[PDB]
Design a binder for this molecule. Structure first.
Ligand SMILES: CC[C@H](N)C(=O)N(C)Cc1ccccc1F
Ligand SMILES: CC[C@H](N)C(=O)N(C)Cc1ccccc1F
Ligand SMILES: CC[C@H](N)C(=O)N(C)Cc1ccccc1F
Lengths: 300, 237
């Protein structure tokens, strides 16, 4: 079990760690979070009490380094940093723990929620979507735009999701215009899976990462990407059977975890109605259709 | 964006543009089968592709053989239309290619956009206007060449005859839309109006009669009356 320690908490802030959140008072004796499960990526995120504008956070994997948080009063945010002195870090954490200054990651033993939301998400793929190669962890916030959003303005601060565009030459084989536009299997299986992603695990990893950035930071371009990747599968008549079964599980847990009061903005009515009721895969998402109908029968 | 009453003079500027109407591409007769079920029988159709500034009409005849063994024909017809318009554009010299294509029905937007991906600078636009181009098959010479076709065929017509020697494109388009609206609302009456006077003939190379300026005013007045009459007969006013 690993630890994300904090030098202090000088400004009042709501701190999220994965799907959990807690409130820290201004100058409250707080030195971070312990008992973080090894084997998964994690996200630690922030919303200041005085400016709910800008949710921001860091994706990290404790197997890749020793990371801590320190507030910067010049840039006005909680920054993640790496401590290269392993002995120094262990000593700090041990002292923090002896003083019961670190809160406990509230993981219930029966609970597989976080695994199920991050099953295919790898830190190495995150770092190619979020480019800042001098750090082992990745910063994301509410306002960052995607490469595709920028085509339609600072590239170093962009989310380099794979561009999907149903009315593009990449999507439409010359001579198969109607075929490829009405049945996107070519684009899914040859262009994206075989060509770009290499396998369905990398595709699902990006899909899951886009959802999580949408949910935790309200990142609008990430929401667009999540829906586009769902729609590309559902609009393909020919999808490997293992992918359909896995997609149903992925979306089930995403819909299950979504805050009820955020569904209005984070769920696109057109895509979901098309995917569940009109698309080729309208009958292939039993778990997802059941939770959507019992939880959001209004949207549909 | 969409083409409507507000930006109507744009049709007659010097940027090449084409209207595309797909109404008459897929045409059927519905009938009973020996067992008492209903079936359709297709008849030849056409794409109506019109330059409103010059009157140039590229009438692509759609022969019933193009539907043989195909399913979902109303959907296929939109994609076939888009394929043929794309092929027409590619056939034209660069300086004759349109800068805009205006589709008369919004369901043509995505098919045409997808077929024209190679032409990103050609704008594909809908319209809010309710244009009467479906009545093209009430023009005798156009209906005749469509019905007689035995294979796919493109036929060229100037739909304004020689009108542009005496009137502007705006006026010609308004005359065309009036004639077609009349033919659409009451074909028999409209045609009675156009041919009542046996001394006014249709030139071999023309579509419409050789009316003098004064006779066109009379004709136009008779067509307006018809449209209002039929509007009263329909609505009881
Ligand atoms: C807002 C309730 C939150 N989801 C929760 O279940 N608890 C345990 C608060 C909490 C969470 C993490 C660390 C320390 C904490 F005190
Ligand atoms: C930080 C969330 C809450 N405001 C709080 O004060 N907790 C729950 C007490 C606490 C627990 C462990 C370590 C440090 C702590 F301050
Ligand atoms: C004898 C008049 C001749 N039919 C003519 O007007 N040409 C061919 C001009 C024209 C060119 C392209 C399409 C339609 C067109 F009408």
């Amino acid at each position: 079990m690993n630890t994300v320690p904090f030098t202090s908490a000088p400004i009042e802030v709501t701190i999220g760690i994965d799907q959990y959140s807690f409130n820290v008072k201004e100058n409250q004796p707080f030195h971070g979070i312990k008992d973080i499960p090894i084997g998964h990526v994690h996200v630690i995120h922030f919303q200041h009490a005085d400016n709910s504008s800008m949710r921001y956070g860091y994706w990290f994997d404790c197997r890749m380094g020793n990371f801590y948080i320190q507030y910067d009063p010049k840039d006005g945010l909680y920054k993640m940093m790496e401590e290269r002195d392993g002995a120094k870090f262990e000593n700090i954490v041990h002292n923090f723990k002896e003083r019961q200054m670190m809160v406990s990651y509230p993981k219930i033993d029966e609970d597989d929620t976080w695994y199920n939301l991050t099953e295919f998400v790898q830190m190495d793929k995150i770092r190619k979507i979020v480019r800042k190669d001098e750090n082992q962890f990745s910063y994301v916030d509410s306002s960052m735009t995607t490469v595709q959003e920028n085509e339609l303005s600072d590239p170093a601060h962009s989310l380099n999701y794979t561009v999907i565009n149903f009315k593009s030459r990449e999507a439409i084989r010359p001579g198969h215009e109607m075929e490829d536009f009405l049945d996107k299997s070519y684009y899914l299986n040859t262009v994206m899976l075989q060509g770009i992603f290499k396998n369905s695990s990398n595709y699902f990893g990006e899909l899951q990462f886009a959802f999580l950035n949408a949910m935790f930071f309200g990142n609008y371009g990430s929401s667009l990407q999540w829906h586009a990747m769902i729609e590309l599968i559902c609009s393909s008549a020919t999808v490997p059977k293992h992918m359909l079964d896995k997609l149903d599980e992925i979306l089930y847990y995403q819909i299950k975890t979504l805050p009820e009061q955020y569904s209005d903005i984070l769920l696109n009515e057109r895509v979901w109605n098309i995917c569940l009721y009109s698309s080729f895969q309208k009958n292939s998402l039993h778990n997802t259709e059941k939770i959507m109908e019992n939880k959001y029968p209004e949207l549909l | 964006g969409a083409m409507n009453s507000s930006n109507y003079a744009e049709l007659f500027n010097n940027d090449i543009k084409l209207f595309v109407d797909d109404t008459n591409v897929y045409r059927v007769t519905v009938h009973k089968t020996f067992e008492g079920n209903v079936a359709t029988k297709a008849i030849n159709g056409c794409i109506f592709t019109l330059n409103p500034k010059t009157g140039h009409l590229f009438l692509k005849i759609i022969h019933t053989s193009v539907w043989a063994g195909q399913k979902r024909l109303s959907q296929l017809a939109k994609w076939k239309t888009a394929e043929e318009v794309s092929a027409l554009v590619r056939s034209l010299p660069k300086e004759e290619q349109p800068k805009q294509i205006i589709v008369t029905r919004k369901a043509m937007l995505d098919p045409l956009e997808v077929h024209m991906l190679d032409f990103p600078n050609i704008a594909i636009r809908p319209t809010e206007l309710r244009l009467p181009f479906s009545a093209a098959m009430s023009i005798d010479k156009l209906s005749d060449v469509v019905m007689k076709a035995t294979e796919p065929q493109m036929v060229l017509f100037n739909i304004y005859d020689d009108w542009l020697d005496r009137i502007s494109s705006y006026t010609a388009f308004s005359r065309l839309t009036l004639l077609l609206r009349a033919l659409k609302t009451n074909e028999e009456s409209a045609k009675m109006i156009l041919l009542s006077d046996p001394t006014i003939t249709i030139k071999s190379y023309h579509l419409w009669p050789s009316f003098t300026d004064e006779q066109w005013i009379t004709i136009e007045s008779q067509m307006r009356d018809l449209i209002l009459t039929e509007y009263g007969r329909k609505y009881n006013v």
